Amino acid sequence: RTDVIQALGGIETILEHTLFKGTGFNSWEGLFDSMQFKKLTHAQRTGLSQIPNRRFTLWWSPTINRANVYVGFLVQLDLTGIFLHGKIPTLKISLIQIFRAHLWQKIHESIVFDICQILDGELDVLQIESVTKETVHPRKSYKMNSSAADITMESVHEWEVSKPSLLHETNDSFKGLITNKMWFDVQLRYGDYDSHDISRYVRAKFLDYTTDNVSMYPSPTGVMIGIDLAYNMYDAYGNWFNGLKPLIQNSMRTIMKANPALYVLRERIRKGLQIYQSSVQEPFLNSSNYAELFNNDIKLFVDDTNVYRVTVHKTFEGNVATKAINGCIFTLNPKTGHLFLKIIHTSVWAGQKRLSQLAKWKTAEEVSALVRSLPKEEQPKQIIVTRKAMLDPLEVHMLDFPNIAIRPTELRLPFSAAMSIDKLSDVVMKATEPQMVLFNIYDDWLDRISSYTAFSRLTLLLRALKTNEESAKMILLSDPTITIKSYHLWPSFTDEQWITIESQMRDLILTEYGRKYNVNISALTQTEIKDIIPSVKRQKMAELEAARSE
């Protein structure tokens, strides 16, 4: 195999065929089915065999979908601008798999509006009147027959724009053309093993789309930026006036390094090829950075366990079919204390199937709608998800919000027991429209104590409701004197009554924890908090090196 690798041209000539360059790897060296054991169906094992064929085809996809084709008709993918050279099925399924949710468009639009921000950042430098966002066609991001102008610059004083040159030409001619109006057109292409030279491509598309007898652009002067997605490349061809060429060079290196749209593309090519090397910058929640939650910023939890809840019932023939009941999205702000409880009505699921993944995408849609309703001075500077599978839809629907620090967690935060609470269950089930019901979790809890006390109280109460439900409900509903006010959730206890309730809930949690896992006691304090609510070994090292130094 060593001489096979040396005979295919080393590692470079192998990986030029592959989709390695489209993935984001800091080095090549970090490149290196639990469903078949489930009783499902004799026929469904065919799809189980189908699954790794997809990653084999996607790994060799630039050399399978390449342009040196003896005979082959250039069809287009569904809803993206990837041109197949023949109806190859698994390649087409893998390219639907990566480029779902109009991610191609959510690349294109994103880059376009990010250039807008740069041109809104650099107005006075280039003497720009008004960077005009153009209302473009909804299918403009993949119409490759002809295009239009994404961004149109207007100028105050007219511009001495050059003859068309690349982004990286060292000598230009700032004398020739004279216009008061640039434009910009971001292009995207899935480059393959043959047609991946991006400068030739963007020069061909710029000299193609200006030079039509049909007119689409407001001026013949513009810059057409083309990003090659499948080879991590970029180039911009067109007319350059003074100060725009280093600006667009630095801007394209900045975008191509750190666009969240391009990086969700790279993450999907990584996870679609089942390869990963993780260096988690600003890590997930632990018992170490547990107070990273309400560090006086604006933030929201997103719980998505009870979005798609079901009730099953027998259905006249023997099968037990599965109806979708009214669900919730438990959006908790820990610091200020609101609760953007989204009530998902059954009319969300009008004739839809594969409701689980579609529920994850609907939860991401509602979080994006909630954030878009908020101002950009109340746009939450981080979002803590609760489940790992939430990260793939949410990082797409928050592509419009690059300010927001999407963080995973490694705490099983017991917000799934929200249906155990009576009034949350009432406002979940009693709905006609898909409603946004609000609460304060912290209702009697913000005249006396801050967010830390009662967030830990809420964690204790909700883990007790999730562990043993009606026992903790009888502990809440013990003293018939202490009632619940109409806009509160929890009973209006005094503080020693809250100490009694918290002590009984903690004893309930650890009682059923011992009666489930027959473990004696927590032999460590952070282990006990971790049991109530990777870096476990790091906090072992931290307490070993901090409890010894006294």
């Binding site: 084709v69 003896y70 005979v71 082959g72 008709f73 250039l74 069809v75 007898n213």
Partner: protein, 134 residues
């Protein structure tokens, strides 16, 4: 689509073969139109036509629904391989060649073959549309 809208919306080799020959003819006529409008040169018309008649298997997609077209496609490729090395003795490599005559003959001989084929196929299809299935 549904599956019911994928069963009625699949069609045979006949309808698609009509569709691909009309793709071919429309490429021919649209390059002559791009000439006649004044956009493109006559030399660039001849190279565009010789590009059509030697990339029918790429520009159109007739190879899918009738595979003996590959014979003519191979012959067109083979005529390409002759003509680009008698047109370019002292010219090297590049577009500009537009001696489209024998590939044009090859596609006309293909049409000579599949006039009665398409007559019988589309006669059976159109009589299923009007008269119905026997």
């Amino acid at each position: 689509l549904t599956t019911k809208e994928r069963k009625k919306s699949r069609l045979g080799n006949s309808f698609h073969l009509m569709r691909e020959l009309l793709k071919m003819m429309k490429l021919i006529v649209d390059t002559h139109v791009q000439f006649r409008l004044g956009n493109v040169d006559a030399f660039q018309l001849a190279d565009g036509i010789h590009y059509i008649l030697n990339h029918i298997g790429q520009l159109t997609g007739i190879y899918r629904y009738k595979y003996k077209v590959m014979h003519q496609i191979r012959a067109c490729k083979d005529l390409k391989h002759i003509i680009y090395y008698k047109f370019n003795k002292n010219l090297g490599k590049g577009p500009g060649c537009g001696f489209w005559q024998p590939a044009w003959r090859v596609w006309l001989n293909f049409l000579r073959g599949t006039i009665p084929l398409l007559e019988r196929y589309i006669g059976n299809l159109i009589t299923r549309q009007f008269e119905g299935r026997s």
